[PDB]
């Protein structure tokens, strides 16, 4: 099947007798769930994103069911604002990004062109918006706040900015601020005709 990116790519996942809505997240290395008391050994781990780090528990070898597919791997548990299916499990169920085909064993980093500049950015189905590391862009910007795994940040919102992504042209909203990596979000992914497929 093919999942478009017009809205958040949410799917039901099953873990034991517990069913959860979770975000299919190409911008996450790891799979991170809210509230649950899985059996067995775990270790503490710190995971980071847009507004800092959170502490989680790492459970290994946990079988999940995603979209009728059987997966088994590491599941992190902690105070994530949304449940997140990461690349560790996305690869096992055969999920790719497609327009050419990008598999998810590595971070889906591509080269983008913005204002004559070449930068590396992450194709992120788990991002509503496109957020770039601090840079100068032209035009009147609007102050804005956004959130991620570790909380909220101030960003600057530029509208109708041209961005060439893997040679595909988009023109849309680009937020600039203290993101850990450049992030191409769904607003631009839809513009270049990207989908999740499995």
């Amino acid at each position: 099947p093919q999942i478009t990116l017009w809205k958040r790519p949410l799917v039901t996942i099953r873990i034991g007798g517990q069913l959860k809505e979770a975000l299919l997240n190409t911008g996450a290395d790891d799979t991170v769930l809210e509230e649950m008391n899985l059996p067995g050994k775990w270790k503490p781990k710190m995971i980071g994103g847009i507004g800092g780090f959170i502490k989680v528990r790492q459970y290994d070898q946990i079988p999940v069911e995603i979209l009728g597919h059987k997966a088994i791997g590491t599941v992190l548990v902690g105070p994530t604002p949304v449940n997140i299916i990461g690349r560790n499990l996305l690869t096992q169920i055969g999920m790719t990004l497609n327009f050419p085909q990008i598999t998810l064993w590595k971070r889906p980093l591509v080269t983008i062109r913005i204002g004559g500049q070449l930068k590396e950015a992450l194709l992120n189905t788990g991002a509503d918006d496109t957020v770039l590391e601090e840079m100068n862009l032209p035009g009147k910007w609007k102050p804005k706040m956004i959130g991620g795994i570790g909380g909220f940040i101030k960003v600057r919102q530029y509208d109708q900015i041209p961005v060439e992504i893997l040679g595909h042209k988009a023109i849309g909203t680009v937020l600039v601020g203290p993101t850990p990596v450049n992030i191409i979000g769904r607003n631009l992914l839809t513009q270049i005709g990207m989908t999740l497929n499995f």
Partner: peptide
Amino acid sequence: AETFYVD
């Protein structure tokens, strides 16, 4: 307005 991505 939410941007997950976990390191």
